[PDB]
Write a protein that binds this DNA or RNA. Structure first.
Lengths: 70, 67, 56, 152, 185, 53, 129, 132
RNA sequence: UGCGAAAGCAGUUGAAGACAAGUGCUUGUCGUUCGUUAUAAAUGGCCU
């Protein structure tokens, strides 16, 4: 599994150990484990071979607002 | 003795050559004294350089993931 | 200048005053020599960086 | 409009508050007055700029303690004008000391950029040649000074 | 009151604002009457980014209270000024000083704020439009600032001359507000 | 130019004068004259380039 | 760079703020018109507040604060509030959204969304070849 | 040259007192000194040991005519300056101070020698004129 | 920090208490104390 900034792998034959800026969602919508965030942002991730992983990543004047340095 | 804290001994030498004068000094000894001084000047230059030194993304990359 | 001192050295020794009459030489020579310690400091630093990227 | 010529010759009290006009300030002075350290450095190295006037803005920035502050946001494109002046300024006795300080900082601040930039390197090769030439001139002046002591 | 860190009195001399460790809490009290009696922790005024940053951002060096008691200005060592509306504890940031602000004083009407610090520059903040006017190149950093007059005719300043480390050199400067010229130094 | 007398403090007398200039003069009221110059607009200089009116 | 508040019935200026250093490209307000948010070329978002009762009675706005959140110009800004939502969303030449809270704009946290979120994939890879 | 490099590598691991003699071998040339520093000195401990040995030697006799130890120190500083100052040992700083004090004397020496060297040049030239 | 010339020569940078954060333990802080000669960073730059 992968997202815009994260890649994860889950093994489906092993069970896991039991041990603000969004809608609070009071209303209804209608009416063995590997995790890495080193690679980001991700356009596309998939396997080329059994052991090769393809991770594709992304590589204008602005009004100047100086940062003070002493 | 020289050709065989040091500045105070050399500065004393530079005083000597002033006292001796141009006429008195002898050429053969002047050759030996010149060679020694040139060696010292090279050493003094060498040490000074040491003293100053003491004071002083790729498009495609191949990596192995750690799992 | 070097030949003037070598040849006329005896005459220059026997002058009542030298500092007033040769004041221009003393000022000019004094100025250059006073820069000498700084230029060695710059030269050592320039060699340090020049050596670094030449080998790399 | 007939009153401008009058200078108050017949009046009791003559009151004058007008401040005399000061000479217009140059671009580099205005930038320093407004604390534009980097821009003031740029105005130092512009075509047709007096050598003495270039030395002051470099001395003022050092006196203000802004030598690195003026040199942070720079690359090889905007660093060469400073190095070009340093190449010629090293020769003169008056600007030799200031060149030594400024050249020291850019090396200590742009070592990495120097490696990847060939044009910056060449500026250092010729600069090392010129400073080495100044070493010969200063060393000679000590020798003529040395023998000049022998005469007296 | 116990453990008073910092204390100020309004220009009228009728309101006292003080900060205590009971980290810290600011309380405002009327002196000659019981009309004004307020207290609130400094944490409420302080911003969250200020909480994330160093201690300079949470350390107050100056405090001023308006005559009516509706506004309270807090200066910080970081150089930021915060005007707090006492009715609802609403904060407003004024940020010009680069170093610690040393002196704050409201005008009699409350529409202007005099500030001074290490810049050796006295700033009149016009609070209606958040603008400001400057009196720079003073002889020393401004320890204290105050408006002195029934109509604010004069400004009284204390200058420090921090150049002399051996002794603290205070100078009292009385300026004419009309043209900002030293009436008495 | 115009006289001015404070409505509360009658003892206060003043004369204000202005011209096609970016400053205005005030004369409080005989060896010398106490004259002050108003030349600061506190951020609103763009709206006011003359005190003449 | 100025923000001006005009009386509608008389069509007259009530207040003038010289807030921005460049063009003001977009404006927005909260539900109760207690806050006015402005943004433009200078990459800053300014908050103008009339929340205090004394301000409300006098009808005077105050330049409460400003924040620098965008790396480039801010062309679009919008606000939304409900019982469970409080958003101030802005975007522009940087090509990314920035999300703030209207009520807690001065102190509240903000989120910078990714420039590209590949919900729809623009790239594929073939294992064979 | 390879034998001396391997011998020096072993002694650095063996903490031998013969490190100094290995460094003073005449077979060393300038490019090999560069090569040895870049390729073989991969541990901080070896870097510290060589610096301590060279610094102690030059401090004892900064005026030694044998230039080799200075060449080692110069390139050791130029190439590994980042790793050297990473070393936080107090004695290493003290050894640097002792070395700096000795070298600091030499640069004071130089203006006097140039003065003496100038006089000797004038003296030799006058003798040549008298000969002619 | 002491001495001295400016160069430098010797010697330091400790302990307790409290608070915050993270998870009794860890780090960081002190408008707290005792003793010794003993990076920064709230977009924040100066009138007429």
């Amino acid at each position: 599994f992968w997202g815009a900034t994260w890649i994860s792998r889950i093994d489906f034959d092993v069970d896991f150990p039991i041990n603000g800026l969004t809608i609070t969602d009071e209303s209804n919508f209608m009416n063995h484990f590997f995790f890495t965030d080193k690679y980001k942002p991700l356009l596309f991730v998939d396997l080329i071979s059994s052991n090769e992983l393809a991770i594709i990543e992304r590589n204008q004047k602005a009004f100047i607002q100086p940062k003070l340095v002493f | 003795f020289i050709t065989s804290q040091s500045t105070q001994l050399f500065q004393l030498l530079s005083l000597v050559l002033d006292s001796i004068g141009l006429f008195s000094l002898e050429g053969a000894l002047l050759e030996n004294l010149t060679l020694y001084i040139d060696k010292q000047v090279e050493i003094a230059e060498r040490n000074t350089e040491l003293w100053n030194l003491i004071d002083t993304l790729p498009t495609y990359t191949m990596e192995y993931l750690d799992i | 200048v070097k030949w003037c001192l070598i040849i006329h050295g005896g005459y220059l020794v026997s002058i009542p005053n030298l500092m007033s009459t040769l004041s221009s030489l003393h000022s000019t020579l004094k100025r250059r020599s006073d820069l000498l310690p700084r230029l060695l400091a710059l030269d050592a630093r320039l060699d340090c960086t020049i050596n670094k990227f030449k080998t790399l | 409009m007939r009153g401008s010529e009058y200078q108050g010759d017949q009046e009791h009290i003559i009151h004058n508050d007008k401040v005399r006009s000061q000479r217009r300030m140059r671009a580099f002075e205005r930038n320093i007055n407004q604390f534009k350290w980097s821009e003031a450095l740029d105005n130092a190295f512009v075509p047709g700029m007096a050598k003495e006037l270039t030395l002051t803005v470099l001395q003022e920035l050092r006196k203000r303690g802004k030598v690195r502050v003026a040199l942070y946001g720079r690359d090889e494109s905007t660093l060469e004008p400073l190095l070009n002046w340093c190449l010629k300024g090293i020769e003169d006795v008056r600007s030799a000391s200031i060149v030594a300080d400024w050249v020291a900082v850019v090396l200590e601040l742009y070592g990495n950029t120097l490696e990847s930039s060939p044009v910056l390197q060449e500026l250092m090769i010729d600069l090392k040649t010129k400073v080495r030439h100044e070493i010969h001139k200063s060393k000679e002046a000590q020798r003529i000074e040395g023998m000049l002591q022998l005469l007296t | 009151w116990h453990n008073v860190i910092l204390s100020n009195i309004s220009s009228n001399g009728k309101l006292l604002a003080h900060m205590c460790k009971d980290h810290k809490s600011i309380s405002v009290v009327s002196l000659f009457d019981d009309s004004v009696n307020l207290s609130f922790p400094l944490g409420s005024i302080l911003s969250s980014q200020t909480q994330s940053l160093s201690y300079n951002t949470r350390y107050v060096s100056s405090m001023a209270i308006d005559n009516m008691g509706q506004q309270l200005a807090v200066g910080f060592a970081s150089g930021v000024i915060s005007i707090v509306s006492l009715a609802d504890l609403q904060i407003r940031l004024l940020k010009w000083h680069i170093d610690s602000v040393l002196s704050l004083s409201f005008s009699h009407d409350g529409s202007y704020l005099l500030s001074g610090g290490w810049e050796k520059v006295m700033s009149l903040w016009q609070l209606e439009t958040n603008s400001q006017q400057f009196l720079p190149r003073l002889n020393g950093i401004i320890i204290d600032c105050q408006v002195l007059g029934p109509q604010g005719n004069y400004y009284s300043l204390i200058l420090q001359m921090t150049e002399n480390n051996s002794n603290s050199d205070y100078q009292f400067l009385l300026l004419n507000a009309s043209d900002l010229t030293s009436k008495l130094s | 130019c115009t006289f001015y007398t404070s409505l509360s403090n009658q003892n206060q007398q003043n004369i204000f004068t202005a011209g096609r200039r970016r400053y205005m003069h005030s004369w409080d009221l005989s060896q010398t004259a106490k004259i002050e110059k108003f030349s600061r607009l506190y951020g609103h200089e763009s709206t006011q380039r003359s005190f003449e009116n | 760079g100025s923000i001006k508040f005009w009386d509608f019935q008389f069509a007259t200026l009530n207040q003038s703020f010289k807030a921005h250093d460049a063009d003001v490209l977009c404006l927005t307000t909260d539900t109760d018109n207690n806050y006015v948010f402005s943004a433009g070329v200078d990459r800053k978002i300014f908050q103008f507040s009339q929340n205090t009762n004394k301000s409300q009675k006098n009808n005077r706005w105050v330049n409460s604060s400003n924040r620098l959140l965008h790396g480039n110009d801010i062309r679009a800004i919008c606000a939304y509030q409900s019982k469970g939502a409080d958003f101030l969303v802005s975007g522009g030449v940087e090509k990314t959204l920035v999300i703030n809270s209207l009520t807690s704009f001065s102190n509240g946290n903000y989120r910078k969304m990714p420039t590209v979120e590949p919900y729809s994939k623009n790239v594929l890879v073939n294992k064979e070849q | 040259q390879v034998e001396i490099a391997n011998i020096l590598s072993s002694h650095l691991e063996a903490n031998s007192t013969e490190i100094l003699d290995d460094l003073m071998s005449g077979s060393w040339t300038e490019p090999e000194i560069k090569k040895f520093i870049l390729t073989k000195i991969n541990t901080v401990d070896h870097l510290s040991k060589i610096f301590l040995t060279i610094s102690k030697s030059i401090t004892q006799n900064p005026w030694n005519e044998e230039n080799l130890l200075p060449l080692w120190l110069k390139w050791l500083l130029t190439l590994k300056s980042g790793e050297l100052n990473s070393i936080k040992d107090k004695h290493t700083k003290k050894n640097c101070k002792h070395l700096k004090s000795a070298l600091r004397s030499s640069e004071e020496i130089l203006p006097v020698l140039l003065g003496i060297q100038g006089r000797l040049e004038m003296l030799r030239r006058q003798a040549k004129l008298r000969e002619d």
